């Protein structure tokens, strides 16, 4: 599922 | 010669050259209150007296050979010494707060006590408060504010007497400075694990760590936290 | 002063070594039992001294 | 629903914890073979230190009290120990007996759990071997044994009047111990009464409940259900098996408009859209509380994200049958508790806070509240 | 009229204060923080100096034990005329004792008060006029080694 | 791959290595205020173990 | 293991037991006849010890008292004819390292009765140690703490077997370790007798001590099998 | 009996004087020092010169 | 700090010169030391002052 | 006896005695008050162990002075005469000390014990 997976604190990295 | 010399800590200095100890300006000439050996020095010229403070005796002489960044013990400051067992450290403590600082040595226990009393009687400065700290209420009335509050007591429940004794007689922005045994609090697991416990207890009491400093080789499984008092 | 500390623990093994044969000296029932490594020891028999 | 107050146990960890009949102190069991006695009587949220029993070497596992005077610990060496609790006497903080349990031949031995008896004064164990051991508490002796259990005795309880002295474990039975007759009260000698196997797996935890309208014996553990039974009719009455998730607080919502079901659990959420279904994103948070409530706008666009600690809101965009995941800023929402959010529109959203707050937020207006009576 | 009972060396303080509740102002930190507003808070009503360290060391036992001294009553009894005063007391022990004695003072003695007593003894020495802090540290040393000779049982 | 792994590891670190000092990160207040301290995991992981020691045989 | 006599009240039906010792503070008791497990008692530590007690009732009644004694010198004593539920308990004054314990002065397997009316309560009580010592109790005289009348300690080696006279006037106390480490005592004066043995005397490792139930013969074994018997006089 | 009171008295001069020199010597501290910074932010631009 | 102290050198406190003299050379020790003026050892005589 | 601290437990004393009597056996118990002294001034004794009936119980108070001075472990047994009989005399003993000795067949026992009167100071 890694294709549509989100993660808000790599996100907020970068 | 020895060439003695100063130290970061005001009223703390070291007597460099052949043998390098750390010494106290001595507030009471002549004499030596645990036995240590005593060197004098001229400067322009007058001698003065200065005891040497050993590491393996009081953890704070400790403290300093592990580099502590920051002490609120110094020249001219009010200190509160908990679980003070006798004269070894805190006579110490009363060298380098000099004669404006007073030094509130606590105790509980009858025989280390007068051995206590004994000493304060040199010590102007030194005014003993041999009492339990578990219940500061009742000492209240001899202790002022004090800048900064060093603890040596060994006990499991430490951080509620740091914690009460604080709350009373600490100024706002004010000192603590506390030596922890990890064996006395937890045997079972390693020191460092009892050292983050205490840090989080301290923190929900209102003080700020700033500095952790493990005291080897001088003592096994000990350290010296030290923080500053935010009651805001 | 590292060769106080060896000077003392050269004394201790001295005179632990001359206990243990002032032991066998004293009155009592011994016997001796040696060790695969060699070691010699006395165990004394179970017997309350008078 | 949050921590009124936290309090460490100067210590090492806990294992056991355990009230006095008077409820004015706690005890707690550490695996450093310490017992604490904290003191409560202060006020809520008020825990002070009292005392610290006689040290040891063995895991308290369990803990329970006679009285207030007291404290029954037992051991993961194999022992039921009986330190004294009550003050006012020299014998404070002593240990007064050490009694020990038959230990397996090729096994630790453990001593899960201990209760006390009031009626007959004796202390009721249960140990790693499956046994169940009663103890005349004034002299420290065993009176009765019973190979009872095929494994682990994890739990015992007791009724009120000590008739009956249920046991369970990890062999996924309960066992009843009866002491109603007259002749056995007179002769003090508890009975295997019978056995029932209610569950699909390990018992962890009963309790038991009396009174002139209720009568419960409640079980649970690994199986993730309880179990409730009659006390008085354990042998013969009817017993239900309560549903393993009964949704009071929907961890699941629908959106009819674009066909999204959205799950979230443990800080995680998972959309899925149906025509058959497919997983168009996952949202991960990096925070440690768990997502109390998700609300999503009637458009689909807005998801809103609530925890007690902050809420978040995240919009979301669908792009190449999958959904976009950005994460809105307002300060206000992440500073606030959010107990329980709807949606006004595709707009503004209605939270209560955790304090009961009610107020209004167009991405606050508060609401007036009518006071309850106490 | 809210009354502090502030215990010294040098004797016994009673502050008379403007606010009869200022023990419920959560504020007390920064009202408190300087000698102007704890002059201007809190202004002496009585106060009982030590005669000499026989007297002193038997006062200092009494507040030890949670027991109200002759002098403390005496001094007390002075305040009587003020009819629905408050008294704030630092200990709950002495605040129960000097509940017992029936005077008209409701006895307070609560958490917030601390910031109270924390700023009366932050500047006592400013607070007494007339002595000096090394005085005042002097028959400290003075009272703490008398006091320790007692129950050292010497 | 594994580094994206990694780099979430060293986002989630509260201490470096500055050479003989750790400087070490502190917490919020209301990070522990809010919610319970962790357990330990060797703590729980020996309750775990025995009852599902090999000699049950749960199977 | 030893064999006593248990009246089963409820009948006034009297049979014997078979006592064994068991593995950590286990009293296990079988009946003599039908081998049935009756009941079990239990006490803390090592069990080293036991011995029985009958204490008479009334006429026709007697109830039986089993005395258990752990290596640390506890003492529990158990009432058989109530399901084995302990009754009393107490530390033997400065024990340490007990090995046996002996009842005296009244039926026991040394001097059994023949009918009902013979049973009698034992009025001494003596408690061995590995380090020799002897203390002896006057059971006629309750407490958690018992004085000892007498700390008998002539031996020196472990004590092995404790044994009263029929009448319990003699308490012969010997050891297995070393030779000739037998001697009688003297009761209720607690004395040592001083002419037998003597230097003379034939006991060699002694390990096995009996005493007639009348005609007052001592019977010794020694580790050389030899059975060596003598005759007191007086009785 | 006279060499096992000969051979101690040398040791416990022998520790008397280790114990006199230790206190003329200085040790060199080898222990963790912690510093505590609030900010994650603080923690990475941290120096100990600074 | 003399009661932190065994019997024994209670014994031989005041003749330490003879008696540390005596342990260096291998040598018999002193048996009295200040304890000889003690009025219990004067009305002893022989080797039953030592005792 | 409230000045006897820490006092042993049952469990404990009954373990306690039982290295007592190993160690006498090899010649590693000093026994008495005084000899127990001489081993804490030359630093040797690994424990001492004391008896709480001791009276006047003050005779033997000088050893906690000097135990904790030197970071040695002592612990309080209950009865004298079981101490005595366990070291391996005739008499009532008030005191006893096993000697430090590394090679020694029971460094084990010693050592388990050790801890435990360690944590129960
Ligand atoms: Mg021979």
Same mark, same amino acid.
């Given at each position: 599922?890694?294709?549509?997976?989100?993660?808000?604190?790599?996100?907020?990295?970068? | 010669?020895?060439?003695?010399?100063?130290?970061?800590?005001?009223?703390?200095?070291?007597?460099?050259?052949?043998?390098?100890?750390?010494?106290?300006?001595?507030?009471?000439?002549?004499?030596?209150?645990?036995?240590?050996?005593?060197?004098?020095?001229?400067?322009?010229?007058?001698?003065?007296?200065?005891?040497?403070?050993?590491?393996?005796?009081?953890?704070?002489?400790?403290?300093?050979?592990?580099?502590?960044?920051?002490?609120?013990?110094?020249?001219?400051?009010?200190?509160?010494?908990?679980?003070?067992?006798?004269?070894?450290?805190?006579?110490?403590?009363?060298?380098?707060?000099?004669?404006?600082?007073?030094?509130?040595?606590?105790?509980?226990?009858?025989?280390?006590?007068?051995?206590?009393?004994?000493?304060?009687?040199?010590?102007?400065?030194?005014?003993?408060?041999?009492?339990?700290?578990?219940?500061?209420?009742?000492?209240?009335?001899?202790?002022?504010?004090?800048?900064?509050?060093?603890?040596?007591?060994?006990?499991?429940?430490?951080?509620?007497?740091?914690?009460?004794?604080?709350?009373?007689?600490?100024?706002?922005?004010?000192?603590?400075?506390?030596?922890?045994?990890?064996?006395?609090?937890?045997?079972?697991? +390693?020191?460092?694990?009892?050292?983050?416990?205490?840090?989080?207890?301290?923190?929900?009491?209102?003080?700020?760590?700033?500095?952790?400093?493990?005291?080897?080789?001088?003592?096994? +499984?000990?350290?010296?936290?030290?923080?500053?008092?935010?009651?805001? | 002063?590292?060769?106080?500390?060896?000077?003392?623990?050269?004394?201790?093994?001295?005179?632990?070594?001359?206990?243990?044969?002032?032991?066998?000296?004293?009155?009592?029932?011994?016997?001796?039992?040696?060790?695969?490594?060699?070691?010699?020891?006395?165990?004394?028999?179970?017997?309350?001294?008078? | 629903?949050?921590?009124?107050?936290?309090?460490?146990?100067?210590?090492?960890?806990?294992?056991?914890?355990?009230?006095?009949?008077?409820?004015?102190?706690?005890?707690?069991?550490?695996?450093?073979?310490?017992?604490?006695?904290?003191?409560?009587?202060?006020?809520?949220?008020?825990?002070?230190?009292?005392?610290?029993?006689?040290?040891?070497?063995?895991?308290?596992?369990?803990?329970?009290?006679?009285?207030?005077?007291?404290?029954?610990?037992?051991? #993961?060496?194999?022992?039921?120990?009986?330190?004294?609790?009550?003050?006012?006497?020299?014998?404070?903080?002593?240990?007064?007996?050490?009694?020990?349990?038959?230990?397996?031949?090729?096994?630790?031995?453990?001593?899960?759990?201990?209760?006390?008896?009031?009626?007959?004064?004796?202390?009721?164990?249960?140990?790693?071997?499956? @046994?169940?051991?009663?103890?005349?508490?004034?002299?420290?002796?065993?009176?009765?044994?019973?190979?009872?259990?095929?494994? +682990?005795?994890?739990?015992?309880?007791?009724?009120?009047?000590?008739?009956?002295?249920?046991?369970?474990?990890?062999?996924?039975?309960?066992?009843?111990?009866?002491?109603?007759?007259?002749? @056995?009260?007179?002769?003090?000698?508890?009975?295997?009464?019978?056995?029932?196997?209610?569950?699909?797996?390990?018992?962890?935890?009963?309790?038991?409940?009396?009174?002139?309208?209720?009568?419960?014996?409640?079980?649970?553990?690994?199986?993730?259900?309880?179990?409730?039974?009659?006390?008085?009719?354990?042998?013969?009455?009817?017993?239900?098996?309560?549903?393993?998730?009964?949704?009071?607080?929907?961890?699941?919502?629908?959106?009819?408009?674009?066909?999204?079901?959205?799950?979230?659990?443990?800080?995680?959420?998972?959309?899925?859209?149906?025509?058959?279904?497919?997983?168009?994103?996952?949202?991960?948070?990096?925070?440690?509380?768990?997502?109390?409530?998700?609300?999503?706008?009637?458009?689909?666009?807005?998801?809103?994200?609530?925890?007690?600690?902050?809420?978040?809101?995240?919009?979301?965009?669908?792009?190449?049958?999958?959904?976009?995941?950005?994460?809105?800023?307002?300060?206000?929402?992440?500073?606030?508790?959010?107990?329980?959010?709807?949606?006004?529109?595709?707009?503004?959203?209605?939270?209560?806070?955790?304090?009961?707050?009610?107020?209004?937020?167009?991405?606050?207006?508060?609401?007036?509240?009518?006071?309850?009576? #106490? | 009229?809210?009354?502090?009972?502030?215990?010294?060396?040098?004797?016994?303080?009673?502050?008379?204060?403007?606010?009869?509740?200022?023990?419920?102002?959560?504020?007390?930190?920064?009202?408190?923080?300087? /000698?102007?507003?704890?002059?201007?808070?809190?202004?002496?009503?009585?106060?009982?100096?030590?005669?000499?360290?026989?007297?002193?060391?038997?006062?200092?036992?009494?507040?030890?034990?949670?027991?109200?001294?002759?002098?403390?009553?005496?001094?007390?009894?002075?305040?009587?005329?003020?009819?629905?005063?408050?008294?704030?007391?630092?200990?709950?022990?002495?605040?129960?004792?000097?509940?017992?004695?029936?005077?008209?003072?409701?006895?307070?003695?609560?958490?917030?008060?601390?910031?109270?007593?924390?700023?009366?003894?932050?500047?006592?020495?400013?607070?007494?006029?007339?002595?000096?802090?090394?005085?005042?540290?002097?028959?400290?040393?003075?009272?703490?080694?008398?006091?320790?000779?007692?129950?050292?049982?010497? | 791959?594994?580094?994206?792994?990694?780099?979430?590891?060293?986002?989630?670190?509260?201490?470096?290595?500055?050479?003989?000092?750790?400087?070490?990160?502190?917490?919020?207040?209301? +990070?522990?205020?809010?919610?319970?301290?962790?357990?330990?995991?060797?703590?729980?992981?020996?309750?775990?173990?025995?009852?599902?020691?090999?000699?049950?045989?749960?199977? | 293991?030893?064999?006593?006599?248990?009246?089963?009240?409820?009948?006034?039906?009297?049979?014997?037991?078979?006592?064994?010792?068991?593995?950590?503070?286990?009293?296990?008791?079988?009946?003599?006849?039908?081998?049935?497990?009756?009941?079990?008692?239990?006490?803390?530590?090592?069990?080293?010890?036991?011995?029985?007690?009958?204490?008479?009732?009334?006429?026709?009644?007697?109830?039986?008292?089993?005395?258990?004694?752990?290596?640390?010198?506890?003492?529990?004593?158990?009432?058989?004819?109530?399901?084995?539920?302990?009754?009393?308990?107490?530390?033997?004054?400065?024990?340490?390292?007990?090995?046996?314990?002996?009842?005296?002065?009244?039926?026991?397997?040394?001097?059994?009765?023949?009918?009902?009316?013979?049973?009698?309560?034992?009025?001494?009580?003596?408690?061995?140690?590995?380090?020799?010592?002897?203390?002896?109790?006057?059971?006629?005289?309750?407490?958690?703490?018992?004085?000892?009348?007498?700390?008998?300690?002539?031996?020196?080696?472990?004590?092995?077997?404790?044994?009263? /006279?029929?009448?319990?006037?003699?308490?012969?106390?010997?050891?297995?370790?070393?030779?000739?480490?037998?001697?009688?005592?003297?009761?209720?004066?607690?004395?040592?007798?001083?002419?037998?043995?003597?230097?003379?005397?034939?006991?060699?490792?002694?390990?096995?001590?009996?005493?007639?139930?009348?005609?007052?013969?001592?019977?010794?074994?020694?580790?050389?099998?030899?059975?060596?018997?003598?005759?007191?006089?007086?009785? | 009996?006279?060499?096992?009171?000969?051979?101690?008295?040398?040791?416990?001069?022998?520790?008397?004087?280790?114990?006199?020199?230790?206190?003329?010597?200085?040790?060199?501290?080898?222990?963790?020092?912690?510093?505590?910074?609030?900010?994650?932010?603080?923690?990475?631009?941290?120096?100990?010169?600074? | 700090?003399?009661?932190?102290?065994?019997?024994?050198?209670?014994?031989?406190?005041?003749?330490?010169?003879?008696?540390?003299?005596?342990?260096?050379?291998?040598?018999?020790?002193?048996?009295?030391?200040?304890?000889?003026?003690?009025?219990?050892?004067?009305?002893?005589?022989?080797?039953?002052?030592?005792? | 006896?409230?000045?006897?601290?820490?006092?042993?437990?049952?469990?404990?004393?009954?373990?306690?005695?039982?290295?007592?009597?190993?160690?006498?056996?090899?010649?590693?118990?000093?026994?008495?008050?005084?000899?127990?002294?001489?081993?804490?001034?030359?630093?040797?004794?690994?424990?001492?162990?004391?008896?709480?009936?001791?009276?006047?119980?003050?005779?033997?108070?000088?050893?906690?002075?000097?135990?904790?001075?030197?970071?040695?472990?002592?612990?309080?047994?209950?009865?004298?005469?079981?101490?005595?009989?366990?070291?391996?005399?005739?008499?009532?003993?008030?005191?006893?000390?096993?000697?430090?000795?590394?090679?020694?067949?029971?460094?084990?026992?010693?050592?388990?014990?050790?801890?435990?009167?360690?944590?129960?100071?």
């Amino acid at each position: 599922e890694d294709d549509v997976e989100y993660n808000e604190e790599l996100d907020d990295a970068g | 010669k020895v060439v003695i010399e100063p130290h970061r800590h005001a009223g703390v200095y070291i007597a460099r050259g052949k043998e390098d100890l750390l010494v106290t300006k001595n507030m009471a000439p002549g004499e030596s209150v645990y036995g240590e050996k005593r060197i004098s020095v001229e400067e322009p010229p007058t001698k003065v007296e200065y005891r040497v403070w050993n590491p393996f005796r009081s953890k704070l002489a400790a403290g300093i050979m592990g580099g502590l960044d920051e002490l609120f013990i110094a020249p001219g400051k009010k200190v509160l010494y908990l679980g003070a067992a006798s004269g070894t450290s805190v006579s110490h403590v009363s060298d380098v707060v000099g004669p404006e600082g007073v030094v509130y040595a606590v105790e509980f226990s009858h025989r280390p006590g007068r051995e206590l009393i004994s000493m304060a009687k040199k010590r102007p400065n030194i005014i003993p408060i041999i009492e339990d700290a578990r219940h500061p209420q009742k000492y209240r009335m001899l202790i002022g504010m004090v800048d900064c509050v060093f603890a040596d007591v060994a006990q499991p429940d430490q951080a509620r007497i740091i914690a009460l004794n604080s709350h009373m007689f600490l100024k706002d922005q004010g000192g603590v400075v506390i030596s922890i045994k990890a064996n006395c609090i937890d045997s079972t697991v +390693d020191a460092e694990t009892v050292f983050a416990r205490e840090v989080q207890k301290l923190r929900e009491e209102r003080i700020k760590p700033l500095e952790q400093l493990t005291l080897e080789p001088y003592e096994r +499984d000990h350290c010296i936290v030290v923080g500053r008092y935010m009651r805001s | 002063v590292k060769q106080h500390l060896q000077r003392e623990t050269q004394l201790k093994q001295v005179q632990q070594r001359m206990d243990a044969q002032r032991e066998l000296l004293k009155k009592g029932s011994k016997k001796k039992i040696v060790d695969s490594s060699g070691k010699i020891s006395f165990k004394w028999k179970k017997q309350r001294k008078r | 629903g949050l921590p009124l107050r936290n309090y460490d146990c100067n210590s090492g960890v806990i294992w056991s914890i355990s009230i006095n009949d008077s409820q004015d102190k706690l005890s707690v069991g550490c695996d450093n073979g310490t017992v604490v006695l904290i003191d409560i009587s202060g006020g809520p949220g008020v825990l002070e230190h009292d005392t610290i029993l006689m040290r040891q070497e063995a895991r308290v596992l369990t803990l329970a009290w006679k009285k207030d005077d007291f404290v029954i610990g037992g051991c #993961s060496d194999g022992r039921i120990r009986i330190w004294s609790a009550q003050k006012n006497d020299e014998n404070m903080g002593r240990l007064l007996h050490t009694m020990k349990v038959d230990k397996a031949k090729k096994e630790s031995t453990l001593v899960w759990s201990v209760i006390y008896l009031p009626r007959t004064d004796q202390i009721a164990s249960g140990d790693s071997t499956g @046994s169940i051991k009663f103890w005349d508490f004034q002299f420290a002796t065993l009176n009765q044994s019973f190979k009872a259990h095929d494994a +682990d005795v994890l739990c015992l309880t007791t009724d009120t009047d000590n008739n009956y002295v249920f046991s369970a474990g990890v062999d996924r039975k309960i066992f009843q111990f009866s002491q109603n007759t007259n002749k @056995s009260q007179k002769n003090n000698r508890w009975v295997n009464s019978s056995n029932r196997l209610l569950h699909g797996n390990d018992i962890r935890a009963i309790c038991a409940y009396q009174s002139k309208g209720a009568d419960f014996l409640v079980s649970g553990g690994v199986e993730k259900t309880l179990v409730i039974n009659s006390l008085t009719s354990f042998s013969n009455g009817n017993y239900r098996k309560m549903p393993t998730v009964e949704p009071y607080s929907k961890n699941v919502l629908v959106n009819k408009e674009q066909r999204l079901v959205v799950s979230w659990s443990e800080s995680t959420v998972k959309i899925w859209t149906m025509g058959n279904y497919k997983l168009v994103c996952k949202l991960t948070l990096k925070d440690d509380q768990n997502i109390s409530t998700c609300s999503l706008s009637p458009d689909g666009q807005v998801l809103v994200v609530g925890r007690p600690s902050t809420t978040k809101v995240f919009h979301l965009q669908p792009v190449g049958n999958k959904l976009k995941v950005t994460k809105l800023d307002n300060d206000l929402l992440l500073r606030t508790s959010t107990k329980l959010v709807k949606f006004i529109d595709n707009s503004k959203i209605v939270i209560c806070s955790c304090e009961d707050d009610v107020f209004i937020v167009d991405l606050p207006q508060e609401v007036e509240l009518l006071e309850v009576t #106490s | 009229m809210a009354y502090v009972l502030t215990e010294t060396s040098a004797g016994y303080a009673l502050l008379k204060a403007s606010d009869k509740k200022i023990y419920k102002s959560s504020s007390l930190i920064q009202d408190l923080d300087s /000698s102007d507003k704890v002059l201007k808070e809190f202004k002496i009503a009585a106060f009982s100096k030590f005669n000499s360290a026989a007297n002193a060391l038997e006062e200092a036992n009494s507040i030890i034990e949670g027991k109200v001294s002759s002098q403390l009553e005496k001094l007390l009894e002075e305040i009587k005329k003020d009819k629905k005063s408050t008294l704030i007391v630092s200990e709950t022990k002495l605040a129960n004792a000097i509940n017992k004695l029936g005077l008209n003072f409701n006895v307070v003695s609560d958490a917030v008060t601390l910031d109270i007593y924390r700023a009366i003894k932050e500047y006592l020495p400013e607070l007494l006029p007339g002595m000096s802090d090394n005085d005042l540290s002097k028959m400290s040393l003075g009272l703490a080694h008398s006091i320790g000779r007692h129950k050292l049982k010497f | 791959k594994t580094k994206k792994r990694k780099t979430l590891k060293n986002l989630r670190k509260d201490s470096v290595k500055r050479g003989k000092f750790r400087v070490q990160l502190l917490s919020t207040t209301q +990070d522990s205020k809010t919610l319970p301290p962790k357990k330990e995991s060797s703590i729980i992981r020996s309750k775990d173990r025995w009852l599902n020691r090999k000699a049950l045989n749960k199977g | 293991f030893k064999v006593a006599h248990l009246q089963n009240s409820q009948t006034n039906s009297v049979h014997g037991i078979v006592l064994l010792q068991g593995n950590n503070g286990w009293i296990n008791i079988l009946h003599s006849t039908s081998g049935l497990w009756l009941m079990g008692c239990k006490i803390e530590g090592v069990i080293t010890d036991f011995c029985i007690d009958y204490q008479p009732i009334s006429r026709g009644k007697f109830r039986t008292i089993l005395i258990a004694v752990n290596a640390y010198g506890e003492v529990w004593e158990f009432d058989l004819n109530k399901n084995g539920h302990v009754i009393r308990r107490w530390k033997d004054q400065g024990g340490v390292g007990i090995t046996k314990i002996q009842v005296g002065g009244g039926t026991t397997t040394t001097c059994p009765a023949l009918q009902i009316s013979k049973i009698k309560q034992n009025r001494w009580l003596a408690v061995g140690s590995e380090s020799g010592f002897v203390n002896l109790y006057d059971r006629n005289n309750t407490s958690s703490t018992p004085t000892p009348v007498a700390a008998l300690d002539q031996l020196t080696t472990t004590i092995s077997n404790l044994q009263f /006279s029929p009448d319990g006037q003699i308490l012969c106390m010997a050891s297995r370790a070393v030779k000739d480490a037998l001697r009688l005592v003297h009761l209720p004066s607690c004395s040592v007798f001083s002419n037998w043995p003597t230097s003379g005397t034939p006991l060699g490792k002694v390990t096995s001590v009996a005493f007639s139930p009348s005609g007052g013969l001592l019977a010794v074994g020694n580790e050389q099998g030899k059975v060596r018997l003598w005759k007191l006089n007086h009785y | 009996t006279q060499d096992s009171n000969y051979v101690r008295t040398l040791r416990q001069i022998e520790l008397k004087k280790l114990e006199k020199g230790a206190k003329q010597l200085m040790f060199k501290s080898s222990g963790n020092h912690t510093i505590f910074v609030d900010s994650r932010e603080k923690m990475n631009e941290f120096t100990p010169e600074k | 700090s003399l009661a932190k102290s065994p019997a024994s050198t209670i014994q031989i406190l005041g003749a330490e010169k003879a008696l540390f003299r005596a342990l260096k050379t291998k040598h018999d020790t002193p048996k009295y030391g200040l304890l000889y003026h003690a009025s219990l050892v004067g009305q002893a005589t022989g080797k039953n002052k030592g005792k | 006896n409230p000045k006897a601290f820490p006092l042993a437990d049952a469990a404990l004393t009954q373990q306690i005695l039982d290295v007592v009597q190993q160690a006498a056996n090899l010649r590693q118990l000093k026994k008495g008050a005084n000899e127990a002294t001489k081993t804490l001034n030359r630093g040797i004794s690994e424990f001492i162990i004391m008896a709480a009936d001791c009276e006047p119980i003050e005779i033997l108070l000088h050893l906690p002075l000097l135990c904790e001075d030197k970071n040695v472990p002592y612990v309080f047994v209950p009865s004298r005469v079981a101490l005595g009989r366990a070291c391996g005399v005739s008499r009532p003993v008030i005191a006893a000390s096993i000697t430090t000795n590394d090679a020694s067949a029971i460094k084990t026992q010693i050592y388990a014990v050790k801890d435990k009167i360690e944590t129960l100071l």
